[PDB]
């Protein structure tokens, strides 16, 4: 068994968590028992599509059961077309500069064969959470900032929907240099412009990546171009309890702060197993303090090549093992291998249960297993910088919960609550007695105390004063009558 | 596949490649110019009639390109910007079709946000009459009248 491995000269923490991979499952007890999963180790310029096609096509020369790879979308696209003309399945594990969010590389790829690439990770979704969050607030008019990285087709559908919701917008480039940008708009715009920005700022949603959106708020407090004057959306996949916490110091006013989730054991320490199968704590337990500085393309890669060794244990299983085909690029004996093909449908039609959840591939070899968490500000005396789980997001169901409950509230349904009166008609009446103790209660007063427990749902412990009287002070502080029960706290 | 064709034409023996060709594949053939160092000639096209946008396409920093661009980069937004402006506009919404690499409205949407009037994007479906019942379908009165 062999696979291809592709991987730019800065992307090598995947090759790092590709090795960590092969060498936990070289271990498995069931899974490839009399097999061990191999690469021939590689790194390219990832800003050299033909550097990568050259590697990939001496490994298919080598011998390969698929391709993986995790590079810019050029070079991604050059494998494509390569698995295009060699059928060799290739997996791709997408990622981005920083970490900007995350659009699709979503290339104009002939529809004349079968797409041989799979993205591990999903198509964009993002988009449907911004709009229902901005659905949640009715902002009339709200500003979206992306980076000079961020392709605005992950944004496309979500600015389509809003114009369907016929609210403003707005738009700028981030640029690279925030201090630069920032500094320039201080200086070059009219003053009135300036303030329609800085106005604009007080509703607005940042789509970049982690550094780049850390320095943008930085900048805005240490300029105060908005303050607690604002209400923000921040999103990414890429938003670990660090840098939560991290955005949460340094952001400003009441901010949405909306992550991935994931169809895994709600349970942490559970996460690490799948029965037989084990998965090192260097990786599966995100309580871990270096757990939590990795990065989600290490899980793509895990479950990438838990993904091969299941869809190579299956062909074992299914007995359709047969010797690698070798194969040349650019040559006139240049043809697919039939056997590629079927293993591009052994992964498709397979599947696992990795730490990203259950990985499988829709009709268009996009994951379709998306889902999103939304934490928030909640600002209170026992908290400062508050923070609370405000909802979650999923096409399934859409937002769960809601992001605009205010507060926590007193709310008293089911509440036994202990109450003192004293008679006067029409005022206050009683009529009907148990054991020497007032039962039943009528009278303007009780009627409203009625409609205070049926609308409140509490459940009132009425007693009549035990001296009757409407109370007045007793000389050593104690009060009597109808007051004195206050006073005393024998009754609320 | 065009690669592997500008291969065969260097074994066959050029003095400079032509393209003309959509990104997706000319940033590859970039890609081959930059290992092979034989000039790369590259005209874009777009599908349907849709407006053109630059390429933009993640290539090396580390070496000289032998890309010769022969439909220009992108003014488009200036231009679009100077009709924006000297009608006094506040409020307006961008319409773009299905196929449009809606990227080439970055600058104007950069430059008319420093003047900081209202938009609103939106794509235009194939079947025009199902997007519109759409609208009825997902706007109220005071929606399409904000429309």
Redesign the interface.
Known sequence: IHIGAIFDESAKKDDEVFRTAVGDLNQNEEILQTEKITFSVTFV???????A??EACELMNQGILALVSSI????A??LQ?LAD?MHIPHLFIQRSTAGTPRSGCG???SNRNDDYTLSVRPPVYLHDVILRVVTEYAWQ?F?IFYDSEY???GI??F??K????????????VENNINKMITT?FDT?RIE?LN??RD?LRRAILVMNPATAKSFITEVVETNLVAFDCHWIIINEEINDVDVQELVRRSIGRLTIIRQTFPVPQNISQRCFRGNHRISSTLCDPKDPFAQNMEISNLYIYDTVLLLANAFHKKLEDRKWHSMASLS??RKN?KPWQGGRSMLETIKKGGVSGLTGELEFGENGGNPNVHFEILGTNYGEELGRGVRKLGCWNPVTGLNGSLTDKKLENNMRGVVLRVVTVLEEPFVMVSENVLGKPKKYQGFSIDVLDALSNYLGFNYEIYVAPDHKYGSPQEDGTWNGLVGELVFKRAD
Not at 45 to 51: E, I, M, V, Y
Request: aromatic share 4%.
């Open positions: 310029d990832g800003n050299n599509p033909f550097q096609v050259q810019g979308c050029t070079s696209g050059s077309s003309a290339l104009t790829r008019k500003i392709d605005i087709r496309q559908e600015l389509d809003v114009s369907q919701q016929g609210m403003d917008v707005a738009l700028q480039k708009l715009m412009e329609r920005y604009t690029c650019i240049s």
